[PDB]
Write a protein that binds this ligand. Structure first.
Ligand SMILES: OC[C@H]1O[C@H](OC[C@H]2O[C@H](O[C@]3(CO)O[C@H](CO)[C@@H](O)[C@@H]3O)[C@H](O)[C@@H](O)[C@@H]2O)[C@H](O)[C@@H](O)[C@H]1O
Ligand code: CA
Length: 121
């Protein structure tokens, strides 16, 4: 993997991967494991999001990619997706701001930069 590490659910600013992406690059991601987005026994999330017996609002408590303050869905993973904007890849458990204090656990995530942008010409 270009980067492998943990994404803590309680990190309100996510986990910086150090991968500096450019528009037109392609990346793949897979994310494993389980986190809590609250203290109650039902408030569990996979990267794809809350367990559906306790749904939360759109995008909340899901694993997203933050690139230059833009957010993109990742969830359990993506394959060979084109990057739309330049920026460092930050992986984030997208809880509601200010509600990370009751979060626990971490995802195990792998990122591969499948290609760096180069046009056919
Ligand atoms: O949406 C993100 C948010 O989800 C959870 O909070 C929403 C949850 O709040 C209330 O649930 C309880 C009731 O006591 O209140 C706390 C809120 O932190 C929960 O632990 C507990 O279940 C509502 O009554 C529920 O309908 C609603 O789903 C999570 O707790 C927050 O930290 C935040 O991540
Ligand atoms: Ca929370």
């Amino acid at each position: 993997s270009d980067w492998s590490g943990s994404v803590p659910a309680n990190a309100e600013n996510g986990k910086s991967t150090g991968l500096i992406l450019k528009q037109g690059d392609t990346i793949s991601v897979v994310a494993h494991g389980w986190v809590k987005y609250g203290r109650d026994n039902v408030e569990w999330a996979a990267p794809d999001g809350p367990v559906p017996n306790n749904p939360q609002p759109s995008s909340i408590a899901t694993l997203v990619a933050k690139i230059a303050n833009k957010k993109f869905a990742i969830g359990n993973g993506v394959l060979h997706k084109t990057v739309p904007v330049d920026g460092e890849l930050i992986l984030l458990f997208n809880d509601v701001p200010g509600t990370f204090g009751d979060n626990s656990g971490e995802f195990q995530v792998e990122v591969i930069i499948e290609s760096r942008y180069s046009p056919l010409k």
